[PDB]
Chain A
Amino acid sequence: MKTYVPKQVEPRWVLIDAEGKTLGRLATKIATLLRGKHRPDWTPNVAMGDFVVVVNADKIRVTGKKLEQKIYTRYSGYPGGLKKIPLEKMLATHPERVLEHAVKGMLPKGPLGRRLFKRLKVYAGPDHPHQAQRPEKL
């Protein structure tokens, strides 16, 4: 025969917690969902993996000293442009990042790996734009 090709599938939204979950353990799952890898109809080259909006990120938990320890680096092309912000302050200002980040490096990278990150919309809250389905999960 010849293995099957899902036609234009509908984009199923979801929603996951945040608060209480361990930062990394979360994405691990979350990731998989952004791609079709949970779906019994996954396909590499199409991105039909679930739009994961997330609620109250600001209360993400994580282990050890990572609160203080963990360092979020950023380097402009300008010599000496290396700016390293800690997980700590990173919670305090725009905490949503920390998730989106832990995440954004659990995808692959070719032009769609980033298309998929657009398929993700966390907030520190809860709240979101109640657009549709978004059936809660666990």
Chain B
Amino acid sequence: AKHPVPKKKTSKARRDARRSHHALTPPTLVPCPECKAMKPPHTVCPECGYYAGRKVLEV
């Protein structure tokens, strides 16, 4: 509600495209050695672990 105001409606397809380069994005996982599950890369899993795996006190 000031100077710049859309002059004529935006067509559905346009909305679509603006959101074409949008859209959701995949995750990516890595195998946990000395364990058996998935973790983010170089991270630690409270179910798996790093070297030695500090914590891992899941009930």
> Are A and B close enough to touch in the complex, i.e. CB under 8 Å?
no
B contacts, CB < 8 Å to A: none
